[PDB]
Every structure is written in structure tokens, then in C-alpha cells.
Design a binder for these strands. Structure first.
Ligand SMILES: [Mn+2]
Ligand SMILES: [Mn+2]
Ligand SMILES: [Mn+2]
Lengths: 190, 483, 481, 189
DNA sequence: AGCCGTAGCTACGGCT
DNA sequence: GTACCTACGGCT
DNA sequence: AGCCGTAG
């Protein structure tokens, strides 16, 4: 499913992880095929916090991300072997797109933590509204989200490792009650 | 701006998703018993004019209309939700009247939406009754190009009647279906006594009533669920032991528990026999047909105790399945674990509001029509002067102001006179306008009597619920055995 | 009770074969459309999907067409609508699409759920005067709807956008053409019914592909226009240029029609890998939405790039032929047609459309003039009209009394009773008089057209010229001698 | 994909070859599961007249039919090993349904010829009109096409073997011209 | 030989 | 969320 | 366990 870029120099290369195959093919046309790569994700990604190691390593979507990044995972992670210095999370400006983003950040934090530390993980900022990525033209997706001249990328930063470990365990872990307590405490119905 | 902290990003993004699944996806509203997808389907059918008296329409056309106008999600999500509402084994009171293959009890799915057709059932008219009479608040759709209902009027208690099952974030819901005669009688008892206990309400509502019928073991699980909103209800298949000839016996299952897949249940019995985890079974056949109904036959080995085999089948297979009651519904836009009384209290309050708002709308409408008839009355009494006033006027605006000043008319009255066709000038029209006015003044007085007394309004709610109970109320299917 | 296998096979296969021929794979000579395409465009017209209105979800368009006119798979309807929106497939696109509608690499469009669509400005010309009794309407598959048997098609769409369909016992392969050239060809034919293929070819040079490219020679074009069958050699637009350090490269900017760019690149890559071609150091697809199509083939230093290019034409789809086989539905039956026959049948359809439109406009003008005549009597005797209505107990009595007293028809009396009081104002009174005077002049104008066959033919010519000036564009495909 | 019947006596058993999975599931509910079996076919099946033996034997739809009938094929065909004495072709009352029927009859004539000769091959007669099998309810498919009480089955008969060989070669063979000539000669526009 | 174009897996919670 | 079996004719 | 039912 990976549509790689022409350049083999990882310093200038960027990989966009797009939500849906419809937005995948659209981003594949609008991109700068010299420095930009596209890896479409079907939809909802496996939650690594709830899944066991055998299931994680057997998942196709997870495997495709590991192969594309070319760093390895966990203890075998090699930052110098990174195939792209920009891993961009490109999901719809809706609640499900926010969920795929949480699922993707959970995988990167638990298996490719130094990739976030090096500032290689980014979040794409597509136009806000009712329209999803799959509904957009290839030129619209380029000018607003992929073009380095006009795009606004959010660099994912790790401040407190203890706080993040607790945050990933509460929100994505198997314990429902702690997650339910977080929802109840921070819920705004205005 | 340029940067984002992973902890803040995770907390905000997950909360945004969690909240959306809770208030706008997996949980039903306490008032109409619907999730956003179901409400959008039924409202879609209402706007498309898909009433029971009209011909069936392609499911793909219904789904597509709902998708573009109100539900910006996958077609499979909308269609499969519409399919369930048409299945008499899923819905105790089906909301969709479907044409074609809409599935079976074996987990057999419906035909593709391009082959099937659908429309409203007669009971769905009661869910949408008085929707265009300012009974419920309308909200802007996802793109702001359409208007959609925040809640349906729901003239029958649909939450408890058809039940609910939804997996959200941090919580889930599992409300079983109930008997309509029992529910309305429960609402009527509550309307006469606000201090009614769960035990007293249970004299009307015996327990859940599944569309698949079957049996319920004891009242203790039903009791705990109605008191706390949580409880375990043991459901049993309707099974009998009968002779098959030559001194041999068989177990005949005619009803299975709610939400249990018949084919999957048969495979689990077959698996136990094969793995030798159960003794005494010689044959297992599914003799179910559209003519004879559900019939699962378990042939018992000669001289073996069939009652022992049946008891073991209840313990080891889904022949006995529990229903884990967890009554979570959206109360005032927020999730809440509710007991039987709270579910009925919130529903009765929605009905009082609907009937009040309907009476208020009908009064405004009547007062406006009376005002228009007053202007038409003046116009017919001075028609020669009305005609000349219009004729001497160069523009519509000039005709409007001249009519308003000369005949002491309002903008609405003058507009109605200019809109009047020449055929309204016929001889008996002045009597028709006078007859309509006199009846309208009586109607205004009738509606004002309702709004002046809370008890008259409450009795109107009671009377309208009784009418729905007499028309749609049916016999109890699920037998509650003691115990 | 019983059935002979031979009779069963002959009847069932013939029933299927005939249906694919007249109601699936072959286009009509008049509008250049297959049933699926006609049902999409008519569907868009009934749904009010004009270019001035906002885009609508493709799933809603497809679903509407499926239930009302096309009882077949959604993928068949959607993929046909997708093709009509692709500027690399259609020389004059018929669908204006929003979202991912595919690429030259064979990448499909996004799912029905995500994309949106509407008519293009040129499609308005295909549906122009459809509700003016120009074409015959037929009952749909279930008898609950009415559908067009053919669209008015105010531009020659069969030859303009071309056609490709695999039927039973036969197939069709008509290439796209230039609109300025086609209309000029129709105009030349309208002035000379005895015009030769050679004379028509002075206007229509040959096919004009949306993907541009090159055509080698005129012999293949000539054979196809004279017999309806011929082989046309298409070539990619390729140039040889320097890349620095005494090194060269082949730059392809246009590829042949219906050739998959990604598949063509893979075939070049395969040849290099299997060492079936010598002199290639690199192969990159530098194509972008900003720069256009750009395929770069880096040539080894001191190797002849012209030799490599010539070998690429022989071994890869860089050179592809178009097998012309012009089979279209003529009078509901399949026929192999030449260039003149295609233009002759089209011109006859236009003459019929314009005639039937003028006849309709005359009937509706005469009916409206009759109604305005009644309203004029009503205003001239309004005091008498009012009193006649007032003295009447029922609408039926008022109807009969008005007809009797003022020599009015049932329609005239009905129109007077339906008249609102606001029509009695000075501005509204003059409006009836102004409309009537305009209508009498319009009736006379239409009568002039129907009284002379040359005036009718000139109106067809003038309307075709207007479409040519508005939608006619430059030739893309170069025909090299 | 086969939904077999309860009875193992082939003399009373019937197999329905249905067009589409939508009609397949619908026929499985409406049927008499004691004597009636269902084998749904995706849509257009392989034309054995145009295909090579290796491609025919490798085709999933073809293999599923061979396994269900349990007779074997060609020279290894055993009529006494038939699992059903009624093989019913149940396709939509439309042009594509007619095509699937021609494709199915081509396979039976070239690989299971004695099955037609024994009168085991039948054609179901569903209600004529615009409605396909996939659009019908399970009870109406039973009452009009599957119920032995009210159904009207057409028994497929072989009269002239020489004529049939020529008919299957002309209509389904690789030679397009002879097929085109047949269309032109018998076409009623 | 194979292509053109109309046709016929995951999240999430609760079970005990 | 996604897919790959098939008919059909003509060209390579 | 893996299933229920709205989501990608
Ligand atoms: Mn989205
Ligand atoms: Mn059990
Ligand atoms: Mn069909």
C-alpha cells in the first residue's frame, strides 16, 4: 500500500499516514512525489496498549509502518536508520480522525519513543469543518495540508515521560473505570 | 502554534472522541429511545413521505438521502441500523416495514440495499406524530444546509418497548425490550401517583418481553435491574421432551433466547457432542421452516434421561443465556444509569411537554387564522370598495397601504385579500368564512381550557396513551417462570 | 412442463446477445450514449444538478439513477459516471466531479460516499430542450417512471467523446474528435448532402485524444473514415535533451490514449531489469499536478538516445495503436458506419429536434395567448365579471355564466376564477397586455420557421455555430505526415 | 457455500443453483431444508466451451458443483452416485439470468451429459417481470418457485445430440463470426 | 497474452 | 474499513 | 472466548 518518494535522502523525505484509501489515492496525486511518501490506513488502527506483542507484530497496518520507517521497534530501534525525518499524521478534522490520531500516537510512544524525542512525529492540519479528507480534491489537499509553503504542521513534543506513561495507560489501557473517571471529570456539555 | 505536547494532544483528542460516541453515537435518548442514526432514518422516512399508506422505496435511495442530509458516516452503518428496525426477531415493535430479504435468526444478513425496499410501520407514525407542530426542538444539520430533530415526539415509550444495546467509551448500555400494554399501564399508574414504588410499577410491568419470546427464570434479577438499573436476567429456550417412536425420546426447542444466533447455538451443541463433553445425543437437526416456525430437534439415546441432557444443554450451550441489564441512557444530554421509575418519569415529562407545546402551537395557528378570516370578512362586506382600491393602485405596495388605512387592516390581512382568487367572491363564501370563524373561536376556547389546567393536560396525555395501547398493545410473549 | 436444450440455448442466448447490443454495450448514433450514460445525465437533469447549483453526493446520484431507471449494480453506474468526469478519458467531460475521481496511473476514484458530482456546462447542450417534446419518452423498467429514448444532443457527442464497448458477436471502438472540426464538418454537410469523405476530412483532420500525443500518418485515419475500420498509430510526445556533463535524457510529456502511465513505466522498468533494452541508467515519474505529465528516461553517456527511444516505441506502450471499429445503434440496430454516415444521422436528429421544439413552442404560445385573451376580456369588463361571480352560488355556476356572457372557453373562465385580486393593480394589468403583444410576435417568428425548411436548417446551423464558438477548443493530438 | 438438505436419499433430494448470494440466503430461509439444497453462484460463471481443462478444474464455482453433485466428470461420471435427482437452475427472469442459464447448461452438456439424459436437469420458473430473485421475500420464493405444490419446473430434454453439439459450439465457442451470423439471422428488433 | 468497459481487518464495554 | 472471480470482442 | 451494534 506504500507509495514511496523519489529521493532516498531521509533528511528531506516526509511520510504521510492518511486515513482511508479514498484520501490515500487523492494525496498520492496532489503530493510532491520526489520528497513525499503516502501510507494509507484502512480506518481504525489496532490499540497497542490493549493488544499483546504477538498480535501487534502480526497486524498488517503495524508491519507496513515498521517496514516504511525502517528503524525497527523497541530495543532494536535505530534512529540513524529512519527513512523519513518527518512522519506526518494526516486524519479527518472530526472525532474519528482524532481517535485514529490517538491510536497512532499510542503505537509511536510504546514502540518508537525516540522518534517523538527527535521531533520526527508531526500532525497535519487539514481545513476545519464538516468535510473529510476523502471528499477533497488532490490540489486542495496539497495547497492546504501538504505544500511546505502554506501548510501548518504541529511538531509532537514529549515534556514529561512519567505523565505521558500515566496518560497512555489511563486513556488507552484495559482499565475502563479510570478512563470513565477521566471522562466524567473533564466532560463539558455546553 | 508550531508545537504540541503529546499529553495535552492525547487528553484533548481522546476526550473529544469519547464524548461524541457517548452523546452522538452509541447511547439512546431517554425520551424517544433512539440513537442519532435511528432518529435520522425515521425522520428521513418522514421527510421522504415514506408513510405506511405509500408504496415501498429502494433502501439505497433512503440510506443515500439520510447520509447526505443528516448522517455523514458509512452507508453500511445506516443500512444495517434500518435493517434491524425491520427484523421482528430484533425489534419487539418493528419501526421499519421492509420488502425483500431482511435477514433471519441464523445471523443471515439482509440483501444488498440495491435489492431491498422500505417504508414506515404504523407504530412509527406514533413516534413522528406532531413533529411539525413545534413539539420538539429542531437543530442545524452537520453542514448547516438542513434542519433535523434533537428528539422525536415518541407518543409510546420506545426506550423500554424496543430496548437498546450500545458500546460507547468508558461505558455501555443494555436495556431489554418490554410489552407495550404493560408499559403504558405503568406510565398511567405513575401519572396518577408520582410517589409510586418500583414494586407497585412491577404490578403493571412484569419484566422484559423479548420478540423471540422464550422463558425468564425468576423475578430477583428483574427486581434488581428495575431498582438499580443493573441486574442479571436468566433467559431460557422454550424446550419440551416428547416421544419419537420405539420407546425413544427427543428435545424440541421452539423458542430461543433474545439475540442468540440459532445456527451458532446449533454448532455449539454439535461441537459438545463431537468433543464428547455431553452424553446421550444421537441426532441434531434444524427443522425450522417459514411454515412450522422455529423447531430444533435433539434426538435422545434410548433409555437415557432427556431431562438431564436438557439441563446440561442449558448449562453448556446458549440454550440458556443471561441478559446483563445496564440501563444507561442520555438524560438532559448526559449519560446516566437509570432505574425503571426514572425511565418512566423522564418519558412522562417528555409527553407532557409534547402535548403542551402542541396545544400552544394549535392556539397560535388558530388565532392567526381567526385574524385572517376577520380581514376576509371586511373584504367581502366592502368588496366593491376593495376592488376599486386595488384597481386605482399602480403597485402592490400602494394597494397594501391603501387597504390597511381605509379598512383598518393589518399587513397580513391586506396580503390575504390581495392573494384572494376571484372564485372566493361566490355567493356562499361569506357564509363559509363566518361558519369557519365561529368554529375557530370555539376551538381557541377548547385549547385555552387545556393550557389553563395542568390536570386537563395530563388527562389528555393519559387518553392519547390509552388509544395507542388499545391499537398497538399486544399479548406478552416471554413467560416469567417462578423461579 | 418440458424444454429442448437446443431451443432453450438458442432462445436464451439470443435474448441476452440482443440486450447487450441494443441496451448495454453499443452507443446510439444520435447522442453517442449507452443506456447507463443517458440515464446518469437524465438523472442529473431531473435531480436539478446543473453547473450553477452546488455538488451532490455521488451515492445519492447513483442510488436515484439505479432505483428510477437503471436496475443494475451501483459499481456499473458509478464507474460510468467517474469516466465522464475524467479529463484524460473524455475529450469533453460530461460530469463535473468533486474529490478523487482517479488518475492516469489507473488509480480509481474515491468511494461513492466521499465524492460529489454535477453537470458540466457542455452537458447542458446534451439535455437542452429535453422537456420541449424534442425526443420520445419511454416507460422505465417497472413502469413507475418515464425516461428518454435519446437525448437532444445539440453537439455531435458520438464522435466528440468517442466510444468503446464489448457486446456479443461484435464490439465498438470510436475515437474522440475535436469539436470545432466536427461542427465545421456538420456545417459543410448541411450545405452539400453529396459531400465526400475526402471533402469532410478538410474539416475533420482525424481523431483528437484528450491525452493529446501524436498520430503517425493519414492512411489509417482515411481507411477508418471511409469504411468504419482502420488502424491508427498513436505515439507519445517525447523529446531528447541534455541533463549535464555530456549526458542526455528522454522526456515524455504526453502518452497515448487509454494507456496506463504506471503500467507503461513498469514495462520500461521490466525491460531494463530483464536486459531486453540497452542504454537506460534511470527511470523516474516526475509527473505532478503543477508541471503536468513528465516521464524521464536517463540515457547512458555516449549512447544514442534516438535509438533507445525508437526501441521503446517498438517494445513498450509508448507507441500504441487504436483499432477503429465504428459500430453504433442506427434505427435501434447495430451498424458499421463511416464518417459521413455518422454525421448524416446526427444532422437528421438535429433537424428533428429543432422542428419538434418550434412546434412545441408554438402550441404552448398559442395556449398561453388564448389564456391572456380571456384575461384581457376579464379586465375590460371587470365590473360585469365580478357581479357574474358574486351572483353565482358555486364555482361550476360561475364557470358556465362567464362562458355564456363573455364568449369564453372552459380554460379561459377557469383562468379568470383563478386570478388573484393583486392582478387588478395598474402594473399587473399592463403586464398581461405586455406579455400578449410579445407572444403574438413570438407566434409569428415560430410560424416563419415552420413555413420554410431552409430557415429551419439555417437555425440548426446558427445554433451549432454558437456551441462551436463557446465550447470549441484547439486540437491536442498532432497528426504527423 | 453449499447449504445441504437433511435427507440423504437422492431420489427425493433437490439442489437449487441460485444467481447471487442475496437470493442464496433468501432461498435458504424459504426452502424445505429436509429435501432442498442451495448452492449460490456469485454471478457470471466460466464458459467451459472457451476455457482450457486446467482452468475449468481450477475454477471454484465449477468444483463446488462437482463436489455437491458427487457424480464426477466426463469419463469418470457415475449417475448412480448422484446426490440429487433434481438439479434446478434458478436464475432471474432477465437477460443476465438467461446468460447464467446458458453458461450452466454448457457445463452440464460438456462434463455431465448423462445427467441431462436421465432428466435430472431442470429450469426453475420464477415470477416474470422487473423484479429479480434477490429482491424477493423468502416466502414468495417458496410459494412461486420452490414449493412442489405450486411450482412449474421445466425438465431439460436432449432430442438431437448432433444438433446440440453444433448449437453449443456456435453460441458458446471461440468463433465469433458464426455467433454474429446467428444473431443477424434470428434478430427481431 | 491481457487489457479496454458495462454486466452478474480494526475500537469500544461487559459478560463473570 | 477493503476484493477479485466471471462474459464478451478485438487488438497486441 | 467472542459476540452484541455503530463507527473507520
Ligand atoms: Mn471522517
Ligand atoms: Mn447456557
Ligand atoms: Mn438480475
Amino acid at each position: 500500500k506504500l507509495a514511496d518518494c523519489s529521493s532516498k535522502s531521509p533528511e528531506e523525505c516526509e511520510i504521510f499516514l492518511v486515513e482511508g484509501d479514498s484520501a490515500g489515492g487523492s494525496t498520492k496525486s496532489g503530493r510532491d512525489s520526489r520528497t513525499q511518501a503516502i501510507l494509507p490506513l484502512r480506518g481504525k488502527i489496532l490499540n497497542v496498549e490493549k493488544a499483546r506483542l504477538d498480535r501487534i507484530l502480526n497486524n498488517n497496518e503495524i508491519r507496513q509502518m515498521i517496514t516504511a520507517f525502517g528503524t525497527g521497534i523497541g530495543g532494536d530501534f535505530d534512529l540513524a536508520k529512519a527513512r523519513y525525518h518527518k512522519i506526518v499524521i494526516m486524519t479527518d478534522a472530526d472525532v474519528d480522525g482524532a481517535h485514529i490520531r490517538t491510536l497512532l500516537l499510542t503505537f509511536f510512544y510504546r514502540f518508537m519513543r525516540p522518534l517523538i524525542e527527535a521531533g520526527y512525529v508531526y500532525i497535519a492540519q487539514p481545513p476545519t469543518g464538516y468535510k473529510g479528507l476523502g471528499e477533497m480534491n488532490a490540489d486542495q489537499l496539497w495547497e492546504t495540508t501538504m505544500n511546505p509553503e502554506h501548510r501548518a504542521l504541529l511538531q509532537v513534543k514529549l515534556e514529561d515521560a512519567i505523565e505521558a506513561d500515566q496518560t497512555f495507560e489511563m486513556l488507552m489501557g484495559d482499565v475502563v473505570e479510570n478512563r470513565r473517571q477521566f471522562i466524567e471529570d473533564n466532560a463539558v456539555y455546553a | 502554534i508550531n508545537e504540541r505536547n503529546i499529553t495535552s494532544e492525547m487528553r484533548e483528542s481522546f476526550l473529544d472522541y469519547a464524548m461524541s460516541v457517548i452523546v452522538a453515537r452509541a447511547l439512546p435518548d431517554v425520551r424517544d429511545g433512539l440513537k442519532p442514526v435511528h432518529r435520522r432514518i425515521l425522520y428521513g422516512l418522514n421527510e421522504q413521505g415514506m408513510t405506511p399508506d405509500k408504496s415501498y422505496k429502494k433502501s439505497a435511495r433512503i440510506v443515500g438521502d439520510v447520509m447526505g442530509k443528516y448522517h455523514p458516516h458509512g452507508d453500511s452503518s445506516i443500512y444495517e441500523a434500518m435493517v434491524r428496525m425491520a427484523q421482528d426477531f430484533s425489534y419487539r415493535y418493528p419501526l421499519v416495514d421492509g420488502q425483500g430479504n431482511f435477514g433471519s435468526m441464523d445471523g443471515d444478513g439482509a440483501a444488498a440495499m440495491r435489492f431491498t425496499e422500505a417504508r414506515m410501520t404504523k407504530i412509527t407514525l406514533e413516534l413522528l406524530r406532531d413533529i411539525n407542530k413545534d413539539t420538539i426542538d429542531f437543530i442545524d444539520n452537520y453542514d448547516g444546509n438542513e434542519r433535523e430533530p434533537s428528539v422525536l415526539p415518541a407518543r409510546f415509550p420506545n426506550l423500554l418497548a424496543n430496548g437498546a444495546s450500545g458500546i460507547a467509551v468508558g461505558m455501555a448500555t443494555n436495556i431489554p425490550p418490554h410489552n407495550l400494554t404493560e408499559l403504558i399501564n405503568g406510565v398511567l399508574s405513575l401519572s396518577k401517583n408520582p410517589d409510586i414504588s418500583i414494586a407497585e410499577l412491577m404490578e403493571d410491568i412484569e419484566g422484559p418481553d423479548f420478540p423471540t419470546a422464550g422463558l425468564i427464570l425468576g423475578k430477583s434479577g428483574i427486581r434488581r435491574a428495575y431498582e438499580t438499573g443493573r441486574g442479571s436476567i436468566q433467559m431460557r429456550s422454550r424446550a419440551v421432551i416428547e416421544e419419537r417412536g420405539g420407546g425413544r425420546q427427543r428435545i424440541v426447542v421452539t423458542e430461543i433466547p433474545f439475540q442468540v444466533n440459532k445456527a451458532r447455538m446449533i454448532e455449539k451443541i454439535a461441537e459438545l457432542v463431537r468433543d464428547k463433553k455431553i452424553d446421550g445425543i444421537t441426532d441434531l437437526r434444524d427443522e425450522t421452516s417459514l411454515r412450522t416456525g422455529v423447531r430444533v430437534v435433539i434426538d435422545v439415546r434410548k433409555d437415557a434421561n432427556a431431562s438431564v441432557i436438557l439441563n446440561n444443554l442449558y448449562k453448556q450451550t446458549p440454550l440458556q443465556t443471561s441478559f446483563g441489564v445496564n440501563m444507561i441512557a442520555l438524560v438532559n444530554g448526559r449519560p446516566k444509569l437509570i432505574n425503571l421509575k426514572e425511565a418512566l418519569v423522564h418519558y412522562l415529562e417528555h409527553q407532557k411537554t409534547v402535548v403542551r407545546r402542541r396545544t400552544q402551537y394549535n392556539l397560535r395557528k388558530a388565532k392567526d387564522r381567526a385574524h385572517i378570516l376577520e380581514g376576509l370578512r371586511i373584504a367581502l362586506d366592502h368588496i366593491d370598495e376593495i376592488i376599486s382600491t386595488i384597481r386605482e393602485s399602480d403597485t402592490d405596495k400602494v394597494a397594501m397601504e391603501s387597504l390597511q388605512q381605509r379598512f383598518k387592516l393589518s399587513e397580513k390581512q391586506a396580503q390575504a385579500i390581495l392573494d384572494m382568487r376571484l372564485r372566493r367572491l361566490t355567493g356562499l363564501e361569506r357564509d363559509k368564512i363566518e361558519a369557519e370563524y365561529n368554529e375557530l373561536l370555539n376551538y381557541i376556547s377548547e385549547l385555552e381550557t387545556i393550557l389553563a389546567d395542568e390536570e386537563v393536560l395530563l388527562q389528555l396525555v393519559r387518553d392519547e396513551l390509552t388509544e395507542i395501547r388499545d391499537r398497538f398493545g399486544d399479548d406478552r410473549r416471554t413467560e416469567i417462570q417462578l423461579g
